[PDB]
Structure formats: structure tokens, C-alpha cells
Amino acid sequence: VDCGPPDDLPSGRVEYITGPGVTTYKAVIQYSCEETFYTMKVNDGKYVCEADGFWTSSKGEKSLPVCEPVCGLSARTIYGGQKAKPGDFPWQVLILGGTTAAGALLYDNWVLTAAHAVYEQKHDASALDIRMGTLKRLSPHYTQAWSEAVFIHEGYTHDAGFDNDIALIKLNNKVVINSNITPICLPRKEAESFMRTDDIGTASGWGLTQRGFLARNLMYVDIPIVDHQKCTAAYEKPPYPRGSVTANMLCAGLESGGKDSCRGDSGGALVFLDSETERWFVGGIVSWGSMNCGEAGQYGVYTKVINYIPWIENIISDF
Ligand SMILES: Nc1nc2c(CC(=O)Nc3ccc(Cc4ccncc4)cc3)cccc2[nH]1
């Protein structure tokens, strides 16, 4: 007859509609989210106490709704690039603790990165120093986060190629999503239509520039997708082993070499704009390339994220 008080909604609130503390049969409550930066999923938030003794929704679901963070926003919509303005890459994440590397925020508690960037520190059983909300790499003003768990892809072989160079970091606390910090969208099934050859993607990071030192400020380059055969043939020579460019990788860069990502950009998100939803999504992860960055005819190689959606949805749902 009495459902008790309702459960708190993460990134959302609860309101008694019938009255304050009215929890009896047919008592009406409303869930909601901060609709600016979160969006309710599952149901409309209207929940009624039913005869089976628990809060139940319009669709007949007895579990909470989900406040999913808004993704893919940008103020726009590294060799040879330009400085990123604030809000350009709000998903950008710096990862310290070993050497300098990067990731990309997914939701408010997950960071997509390269397995090669975080392999050494996970296997030392040390939490990752994760920072975001800042364009300057060495600034003391930043949003702090820490790793709860690190999930490296089970087909990744460290220092033995870069196939399945993908990893997920679970943040031990949720990040506050604002105009400065916003996750990147995961690609939908038809997102390959925005990733054909010669389609433009943007890589961003703090890695080496043409001057040969790490950048103090976040930089970025627009670069086009390269034909896969053209990229496989580009790396079919020593010192590279046979089969270095796999089907789980896309390549991006110029024949002339003027634009690339380098050391220190590892794990960053190579992103593409969905012109219909008007939202940026992650197409690639910064993985590898030639040792001499910006080398002509030596394209940057990126982990093909759309191949790893079932792996991503496995871990994020199950953990
Ligand atoms: N342009 C470019 N350089 C990059 C580097 C530096 C880098 O990764 N250098 C490297 C080159 C070759 C190998 C050998 C190898 C073995 C098997 N399969 C592929 C390659 C290893 C590392 C890091 C991150 C992004 C990069 N963007």
C-alpha cells in the first residue's frame, strides 16, 4: 500500500506531485534531469506506485530513468595545426603518470583512449592522473579525475603491433558536464557515410609539433581519410612488420606530410561532424604512424572505433 520514498536519480531530481512525502498507492512522482546538459532516457519520468509495491512508470518499467549527458557539442560547429579555442574539444582529456597522452570523455565517467598509452601504468597497479577542462597542459587549474578501473582490449598485444589499440578507463567519480567539459558521441551505424575517403576528420592533442617539442596549449589539425590500400602500401617496408595496417585501422593525412599527429597525441579522439545531427563523434583513436612525424606519404594510423562498438557497449553496460 505504501511504496516508501523514491530512489535518487543520478544527474537528476525527484519531485512528489500528489504531495510531499505522499508515497501511497497511486501516488504520483516526477523524475527529471538538468535538460541543458543531460537528457532523460527510458521513460518520461512520470512514475506511480502500483499494486505490486514499487514505483512504476508510464511504460510499465519499475527501474529508474537514465540521465545521459549531451554529447558532441563544440564551439567550432599535432604537426601543422592551430591552437584550439575553449569549447572546441570539450571532450579532451590529458592523462599523466607515465608519459604524456590523451583520451576523450564518454558520458560523465568514462574515457576512451589507446591501449598503448595506458598499458604500462595499469599493469603497475597505479591509478591514472586524469585531467580535463583545460587547454594548457601544465596548468594547475583543471578538473581532476581518477581511474577506478582500466579495461584494455583483450586482443591488444603491447609492443607487438597496434591492432585493437583501444582501452576504456572508468572514472571513480562523475564529472560535471558544462560548456567547458562535454563528452564526444560514439558513432552510430551509418557514421561510415561521414568517413569515406577524402572526408575530413580533426585530431587534437598536446603532442609534438613541427618544432619537435610538446605543445603547451591544445592544438588541432583537419586531415582527410586516406584509401586503405594506399595506407597499407605506405607502411609495407622496413622497419615495419608485415601486416602493420589492419582492417581495424583507418589512416588520415596528406601525401605531402604537412599535417599529422605525433608522439604525445596518443589516445586522442579523431572526430568527425555528423552534418545531419550537427554533432561531433569519435571516428578514430590516435594510435601510431611514422617515427618522423609529418613525413610525406606516411599517414597517421588510427584505431577504427566503429569496429569496437560491441566491445565498448559490453564494458560500459557491464561495469
Ligand atoms: N605519425 C605518428 N607517429 C606517432 C607516434 C609515435 C610512434 O608510434 N612511433 C612508432 C613507429 C613505428 C613503430 C613500429 C610498428 C610496429 C608494428 N606496427 C606498427 C608500427 C612503433 C612506434 C605516437 C602517436 C601518434 C603518432 N602519429
Give the closest residue (by CA) to ligand 1 atom 9: 291
Q: Could you give the C-alpha distances from 13 to 4, 24, 44, 249, in angstroms and in order?
A: 16, 20, 13, 42
Active-site residues: which are they?
116, 165, 266
Domain spanning 12-68: CATH 2.10.70.10: yes
Give the closest residue (by CA) to ligand 1 atom 16: 161
Q: Which three cell numbers stand for residue 125?
A: 597497479
Q: Which atom of ligand 1 is nearest to the CA of 162?
A: 18
Phi, then psi, of 6 in degrees rounded to 5: -80, 170
Q: How many CB atoms lie within 10 A of CB 247?
A: 10
Sequence-distant contacts of 194-200: CB under 8 A, at least 24 apart: 194/272, 194/273, 194/274, 194/275, 194/283, 195/225, 195/250, 195/272, 195/283, 195/306, 196/225, 197/224, 197/225, 197/226, 197/227, 198/224, 198/225, 199/224, 199/225, 199/272, 200/224, 200/272
Instruction: Give CATH for domain 184-305.
Output: 2.40.10.10
CA–centroid distance, 36 to ligand 1, in Å, is 40
Closest listed residue to residue 131, CA positions, set 85, 76, 169, 188: 169
Q: Which atom of ligand 1 is nearest to the CA of 301?
A: 27
Chain position carrying cell 568514462: 110
Contact yes or no for 245/162 (Cβ under 8 A): no
Give the closest residue (by CA) to ligand 1 atom 3: 289
Residue 165 and residue 128: Cα distance in Å, rounded? 18
Helix (H) or strand (E) holding 122: helix 115-122
Handedness of CA 23, 28, 33, 39 (dihedral sign): positive
Pocket test for ligand 1, best of 221, 248, 288 (most atoms within 8 A of CB): 288
DSSP 30-41: EEEE-TTTEEEE
Residue 263 and residue 206: Cα distance in Å, rounded? 9
Give the closest residue (by CA) to ligand 1 atom 15: 240
Q: Ligand 1: residues whose CB is within 6 Å?
A: 161-162, 240-241, 244, 260-263, 265-266, 286, 288-291, 293, 300
Put residue 316 in one of left, alpha, beta given phi > 0 → left and psi -120 to 50 → alpha. alpha
Q: Identify the CATH class of 92-182+310-318.
A: mainly beta
CA–centroid distance, 301 to ligand 1, in Å, is 8
Phi, then psi, of 214 in degrees rounded to 5: -60, 145
Residue 18 and residue 134: Cα distance in Å, rounded? 45
**Which residues of the chain are in CATH 2.40.10.10 domains?**
92-182+310-318, 184-305
Helix (H) or strand (E) holding 69: strand 66-69
Q: Which three cell numbers stand for residue 3?
A: 511504496
Phi, then psi, of 137 in degrees rounded to 5: -65, -45
CA–centroid distance, 86 to ligand 1, in Å, is 29
Residue 24 and residue 53: Cα distance in Å, rounded? 9
CA–centroid distance, 291 to ligand 1, in Å, is 6
Residue 85 and residue 179: Cα distance in Å, rounded? 13
CA–centroid distance, 262 to ligand 1, in Å, is 8
**Which residues of the chain are in CATH 2.10.70.10 domains?**
12-68
